[PDB]
Structures are given as C-alpha cells and as structure tokens.
C-alpha cells in the first residue's frame, strides 16, 4: 500500500501543473485525478513515503504559482489501509478499460 | 442488514482520510463512496453497530484534521431496512462489474 | 397512481435515514432516489395517501436528527396524474435492468 | 410544432408537483424533464397555446406551494420552430429506447 | 467553417427561447446546446457571419424577456478555425447516433 | 511530450473564443476541453513551447474581450512528464471512439 499522495485544487489548469510537479519531483506514479464537483479536482500519486512527500511538496508550490492556481486541500497517508484501495480511486487504471468501453 | 455507517465531506482528500480511519478503527467494510455533486462526497462502511460506531467516530476526527477537511454530514442506522439496500449504494460492488464494462 | 411521497435533502447520509424512516413508518415502497446536483437528493416512496403521509412525516424528523441532516424540500401528490409517472422517476426499476446493462 | 411549455425549478420534489399540475390543468403532454445541474430542473409539456398556457400557469402556483418549491424560470413558445425540436428535448421519448439500452 | 454563433444563459427555459429566436431571425442551423453545469447552458448555431449575427442578436433580446431569462455570455467567431470543430460541440449530431446507442 | 497549454474560464462562450485564438495564434493542436463543474472549463492545446506560449497568450486576451469572458486559470508545462499524459486529458481523442459508442 505504498504511501499515497494527493492534492486538491480549484480549477483544472492548476491541477495539471500540480500533477506535472509531483510526478517530476520524485519517484511517484500519477494514479489518477478525481472530480468532486464545484471546480474541485484532486491529483493522486503513489510511491514511497518520502517520495510521495517530496512530490506533494513541489506540486503545491507549482500549483499556486499558476495563473489561477488554488490548492484547496492536501494529504498523504504513509501506509494507507488496503480495503481503502478497493473503494477509492487511489489505484491503477487502463487495465479493465477494454471491457468498460 | 448489519449497521451502516457513512460520513459526508466537502473535498475528496478529506473523504479518503475519513475512509481510511473508519476501516482501521473497527471491523467495518468500506462498501463505497457516493458523489452528490457540489464538492460533497460520502463514505460508507458496514459492520456491527458498535463497530460501525467506533469507526464513524474516528473517521470524523481524522477527516477534520486534514488540510481542508470539512465533515459535512454523518449518520448510522443500526439495523437499516432491507429494501433500502437494493436502492441505495450501501452494499457491495465488484461482482457484476464484468457485465457492466 | 397511488399517492407519491418524496423528500429532498442536502447530503447523502441524511437522505438514506429519511428513506429508512418512510419505508418503516408506513406501508410505503421506496421507489427510488433522485440526484439534482449540488448536494441535493430526493427519496421517493409510494403507497396510500395516509400511508405516504405518515412516512414522509417520520422521514423528515429522522433526517433532521442526522449529523448534518438538512431536509431541503418535501411533497406528496395524493392521486398524481399518470402521464407524470412515465416521465419522472416516481415508478419502479430493476425490471428493464438486464437490457440497459 | 404545437406550443411548448416548460418551467424550471430548484429541487426535484417541486418540479414533479409542477409537472403533475400542468398535465392536469390542461390537455398537455408531459414530454420530459431536463437537468441543467446545480439543483436546477425543467419540466416540459406540449399542447395548444392556451392549453400549454393554462397548465404552465397552474404548474407555477402548485410548485411554489411545495415545502421548498422554488420556480426558477418559465417560458412558452406558441409556434416554436421545427429545427429546434430536433436539437432540444422538447419532443417524445420511449421509442428508440430499445436501441439505446 | 461558416461562422459560429452561441449564447449562454442561466436556466433552460431561457436557453430554448434564445434558440428559437436565432434559428428564426436568420438562416442559421441550431447545431446543439451545451451544459457547463451550475444552471449554465449555451446554444450554438451556424450560418454566414451576418446571418449568425442577426440571430445571436434577436436571440439575446428574446431570452431576456423570458420569465427568468438570464443571458450569461455571448460570442461569435466569423471564420472559426477547423481543428476547433473536431474538439468542441460546434458541429452536427444525429449521424453516429445509431452506433453510440 | 511537446509542451502543453491550457486555459480555464468561467462560461462556455468564453472558452470557445479562447480555443479559437490559441489554435490560430500558433501551430498548436487543440486536444480537448475539460469541464470541472461550477461554470469552469479548460481548453488544452499542444505544440512547441513558444508555439504553445504565443497561443495561450492570445487566447487569454480574446477570451476576456468576450461578452462575459472570465479567464479563471492558466498554465503551460514545457516538457510535461509522460505518465501525466496517460492519466489526464492532455492527449488526442477520436480514435477509440468507435469502441466507446
């Protein structure tokens, strides 16, 4: 359940820049982006605890510097419980895509 | 119809942390997360009444401590009526997934 | 066109408790739950006029007592017009489910 | 292109009551209900100009009397242009339903 | 890429009246209506520059006269770039409908 | 991962004009438009860094001049990480469209 790092934000252009940062600032895998509605959107990454940290870190600074960047919330569980992974979009995609479509 | 515990929240990062808590603080199964729109999202678990309690409890404290955590609503029916289970997302998933896709 | 009873609410956990009430407080069948967007969600039941009443009644008290329960709107047509039933989600589901999927 | 009558409203319970009225107050056919998002929902009927009137009239009074009824907008084109009918949900449904599903 | 004329509006009944106008006031084809969420909805038409003008014109006056008409935004590109047409809903529908369904 | 340029905006008519600009002001390919909810919508283009710049530039001026144009956010990654491309809508569409439908 390698640490999970996510960061919410108001606006899409700022969420992309946050995602580009996290994935660059550390050895973290961008797992997905979640839309809660009301201009709110989270970006989730996975990797070690200090990896997931270093990236959630940068991500936030880069997001805010955006022409409208508004980091709404931020969090990271180090060793997030497993059951959690089969209920939330903290995991991988692409795979069962052929079946969905 | 083992007790049902859910907790709403504004923002996704705070709903995940709420879910990670509930599922850890007790013997409860995270059944799913519901999106009502407008930054609002609920997390639902299942287990005994005191199990579902102990977890909805912790969940709320952990959510609020989040960098933007905003617990919107909270509830738990101890012995929630059956018909209710076949109309609301209080149950299990994964199973008929192959057919949907 | 047996009377129709519904109750809107802000938040999902409060809408479930409202539904658990109505369906218990009287001989009413929970037909479905509607999402209008913006944290708003209605619960609809069917039964006699006094049955659909007694339940929409309880439902409201139980919803409000919820940790965030916010009953938004409430209504009941006693003998609601038929055409209405084939345009709104006031009816039954499950049946043409195999075809949809 | 028999006149078209519709009425928007905040909340679902109030839109249903609006629909139950229009379809009763006149010889109008409830064609459908549209969701624009943000608690907003329209109800559309069809019939003569004075029929579509008499019903959009009542509809509004009945909606407002609802425990949360909030008529947002209201309109009626008497002889609404045809092209319009093949781009907006002002028409009939049910028919190509078997193919969709 | 014959000029494109669109007009946003708060509420559905006002967007329909806007659409009924544009399509009548000129030789323009109502291509579609877009929902951005939050009671906001645009209506798009196509035709010459002066045709698409004359209609976006009327449309706005007719929309505002509606019992709740609220024209939110308005625009028209005369010779809108092609790539744009294969990314936005400025074009025609109906055609690949059988496949979608 | 040729530079990515996007610009958010409140309202749809202003997002279209922004897109019409970017795609004209430079050698950039409009990849798509994203809806975050709450009247917010982004437009994304791809091309060189200075190409993607020159266009995100114009786009913003043209959007603001719109009858309701409200540029919400703005950004551009020059060499945006690859993983990012398989999680966000920064890429191409049309292709697997036949399968989706």
Per CB-CB distance under 8 Å, the chain B contacts of A15 are none
Which sign, positive or negative, has the C-alpha torsion C27, C33, C36, C40? positive
CB atoms within 10 A of CB C72: 27
Phi–psi pair at D98, nearest 5 degrees: -60, -35
**F39-72: b or e for each residue (b if 16 or more CB lie within 10 Å)?**
bbbbbbbbbeeebbbbbbbbbbebbeebbbbbbb
Three-state secondary structure call for residue E44: strand
Residues of B whose CB is below 8 A from A37: 35, 37-40
CA distance D88 to chain E (A): 7
8 Å CB contact of C11 and B37: no
CA of C63: which chain B residue's CA is closest?
A: B75
8 Å CB contact between F14 and E71: no
Structure tokens at C100: 């949809």
Residue B43 · residue B63 · CB < 8 Å: no
- Fold of domain C1-101: Alpha-Beta Plaits (3.30.70)
- Crossing angle between the packed helical segments C13-25 and C49-64, to the nearest 10 degrees: 140
Question: Which conformational region is residue C42 in: left (phi greater than 0), alpha (psi within -120 to 50 degrees), or beta?
Answer: beta
- Domain chopping of chain F, boundaries: 1-101
Whose tokens are 């976006």? That residue is E56
The angstrom resolution of this structure is 2.9
Q: Closest partner residue to E30 among D42, D87, D96, by Cβ? A: D87
Closest CA to C76 of D24, D68, D52: D68
Closest residue on chain C to D17 (Cα): C77
SS3 category, C69 = coil
User: Reduced to 3 states, what is the DSSP secondary structure of residue E84?
Assistant: helix
**Sequence-distant (≥ 6) Cβ neighbours of residue F98 within 8 angstroms:** E99
Numbered residues of chain E with Cβ closer than 8 Å to any chain F Cβ: 4, 6-8, 34, 36-38, 40, 42, 72-75, 77, 80-81, 83-84, 86-88, 90, 96, 99-100
Contact A91, A61 (CB under 8 A): no
Residue of chain B with shortest Cα separation from C37: B37
Structure-block tokens of residue D63: 């909606």
Q: Chain D: nearest CA to C100, how far in angstroms?
A: 4
Distance from C-alpha of A94 to C-alpha of A101, rounded to nearest angstrom: 11
Residue of C33, C26, C23, C17 lying closest to C65 (CA atoms): C17
Q: How far is D90 from chain C (nearest CA, A)?
A: 13
State the alpha helices, DSSP H only, in C38-81: 49-64
Report chain breaks in chain D, C–N > 2.5 Å, as residues after which they occur: none
Kindly report the backbone phi and psi dihedral angles of residue D30, in degrees, each rounded to the nearest multiple of 5, phi listed first. -65, 110
Using DSSP, state whether A27 is helix, strand or coil: coil
Q: Measured between CB atoms, which of A19, A66, A68 is closest to F84? A: A19
Across the beta sheet with F29-35, what order do the strands follow?
Answer: F29-35, F40-46, F4-10, F70-77
Nearest CA distance, C80 vs chain D (angstrom): 6
E57 is written with which tokens?
A: 């014109």
Angle at F44 between CA F42 and CA F45, to 5 degrees: 155
Give the number of residues written for chain B: 101
The C-alpha atoms of residue B2 and residue B23 are separated, in whole angstroms, by 15
If DSSP codes are grouped into helix, strand and coil, which group holds residue F29?
Answer: strand
Q: Is residue A45 classed exposed, middle or buried when 0-12, 13-18 and 19+ CB atoms within 10 A define those classes?
A: buried
User: Which residues, other chains included, contact C15 with Cβ-Cβ below 8 Å and sequence gap of 6+?
Assistant: C7, C9, C33, C41, C42, C43, C63
Residue C79, Cβ neighbours under 10 Å: how many? 12
Q: How far is CA B100 from CA A87, B49, C97, in A?
A: 17, 32, 11
Which chains would you list as touching F if contact means 3+ CB atom pairs under 8 Å?
A: A, E
CA distance D100 to D7: 27
User: F60: alpha, beta or left, given left = phi > 0 and alpha = psi -120 to 50?
Assistant: alpha
- D57: enclosing H helix or E strand: helix D49-64
Which tokens is B3 given? 């007790």
Distance, in angstroms, between A67 CA and closest chain F CA? Answer: 5
Q: Please say whether the beta carbons of B42 and C49 come within 8 A.
A: no
**H helices present in E4-48, as ranges:** 13-25
Closest-CA residue of chain C to B79: C20
C-alpha–C-alpha distance, residues F101 and F96, integer Å: 9
User: Please, what sign has the CA dihedral across residues B79, B82, B88, B94?
Assistant: positive
Count the alpha carbons within 13 Å of D80 in the hemisphere toward its beta carbon.
Answer: 31
Show Cβ contacts of residue F18 under 8 Å, excluding neighbours closer than 6 positions.
Answer: F7, F9, F43, F59, F60, F62, F63, F69, F71
* Long-range interactions of C59-62: CB distance < 8 A, separation 24+: C59/C7, C59/C18, C59/C19, C59/C21, C59/C22, C59/C25, C60/C7, C60/C18, C61/C21, C62/C17, C62/C18, C62/C20, C62/C21
Distance of alpha carbon A78 from alpha carbon F101, whole angstroms: 40
DSSP-assigned letter for residue D77 = E
Which residue of C lies nearest to B89 if distances are taken between CA atoms?
C16
Phi, psi of E70 (to 5 degrees): -135, 85
Chains touching A by CB (3 or more pairs below 8 Å): B, F
Using DSSP's 3-state secondary structure scheme, residue A86 falls into: helix
Q: Which of D72, D77, D96 sits opposite E17 (nearest CB)?
A: D77
Q: How far apart are CA B23 and CA B58, in angstroms?
A: 10
* Of B48, F55, B82, A27, residue with least CA distance to C30: B82
Q: Environment class of residue A70 by beta-carbon count within 10 Å: exposed (0-12), middle (13-18) or buried (19+)?
A: middle
Using the 8-state DSSP alphabet, how is residue D66 labeled? S
Residue with tokens 């045809």: D82
* Strand bridging mode E4-10 / E70-77: antiparallel
Question: Of A8, A11, A12, which to mutate for an interface test with F (greatest number of F Cβ within 10 Å)?
Answer: A12
Copy the structure tokens of residue D46: 């069809």
- Which H or E element spans position D59? helix D49-64
Please name the residue ranges forming H helices in A26-84: 49-64
Find the chain A residues whose C-beta atoms sit closer than 8 A to any C-beta of B. Answer: 4, 6-8, 34, 36-38, 40, 42, 72-75, 77, 80-81, 83-84, 86-88, 90, 96, 99-101
Q: Count chain A–chain F contacts defined by CB atoms under 8 A.
A: 88
Q: C67 and B87: CB-CB below 8 Å?
A: no
Token digits of residue F52: 């993607």
Place of tokens 């975050």: F36
Contact criterion met (CB < 8 Å) for C74 and D19:
no
Asked whether the CA dihedral D10, D11, D12, D16 is positive or negative, the reply is: negative
C41, β-bridge pairs: C9, C35
Residues of C in contact with B72 (CB under 8 A): 11, 39, 68
String of DSSP letters for chain B:
---EEEEEEESSHHHHHHHHHHHHHSS-EEEEEEE-SSSEEEEEEES-HHHHHHHHHHHHHHHHTSBT-EEEEEEEESS--HHHHTTSTTS--STTHHHH-
B40-46/B4-10 β-pairing = antiparallel
Query: Percent helix, strand and coil across chain A, each rounded to 5?
Result: 35, 30, 35
A77 sits in which H/E element: strand A70-77
Closest CA to C33 of A38, A101, B42, D74: B42
Distance separating alpha carbons of residues C7 and C76, to the nearest angstrom: 9
Instruction: State how far the Cα of F55 lies from the Cα of A5, in Å rounded to an integer.
Output: 33
End-to-end CA distance of chain D: 28
What is the rounded CA–CA span in Å between residue B5 and residue B22? 9
What CA dihedral angle connects B76, B77, B81 and B82, to 10 degrees? 40
Q: Output the CA–CA distances (angstroms, integers) from residue D81 to D28, D92, E6, E12, E21, in the order listed.
A: 18, 16, 17, 17, 9
Q: In whole angstroms, give the CA distance from residue B83 to residue B3.
A: 14
What distance in Å separates the CA atoms of residue D86 and residue B92, rounded to the nearest whole number? 41
Whether residue D13 and residue C88 make contact (CB cut-off 8 A), yes or no, is no
Work out whether strand A29-35 and strand D40-46 pair parallel, antiparallel, or are unpaired.
unpaired
Instruction: Provide the β-strand partners of residue C76.
Output: C5
CA distance E79 to E1: 6
Q: How far apart are CA C46 and CA C6, in angstroms?
A: 9
DSSP A7: E
* One-letter-per-residue 3-state SS of F23-79: HHHCCCEEEEEEECCCCEEEEEEECCHHHHHHHHHHHHHHHHCCCCCEEEEEEEECC
Contact F13 E42 (CB under 8 A): yes
Bridge partners, E29 (sequence order):
E46
The SS3 assignment for C16 reads helix
- Nearest-CA neighbor of A19 among A36, A39, A41? A41
- Of all helices (H) and strands (E), which one includes residue F45? strand F40-46
E strands, chain C, in order: 4-10, 29-35, 40-46, 70-77
């Amino acid at each position: 359940s390698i640490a999970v790092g996510m960061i919410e934000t108001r606006g899409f252009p700022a969420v992309v820049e946050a995602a580009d940062s996290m994935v660059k600032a550390a050895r973290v895998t961008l797992v997905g982006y979640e839309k809660i509605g009301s201009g709110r959107v989270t970006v989730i990454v996975r990797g070690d605890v200090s990896g997931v940290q270093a990236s959630v870190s940068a991500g936030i600074e880069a997001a805010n510097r955006v022409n409208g960047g508004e980091v709404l919330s931020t969090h990271i569980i180090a060793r997030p419980h497993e059951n959690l992974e089969y209920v939330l979009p903290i995991r991988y995609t692409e795979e069962v895509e052929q079946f969905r479509t």
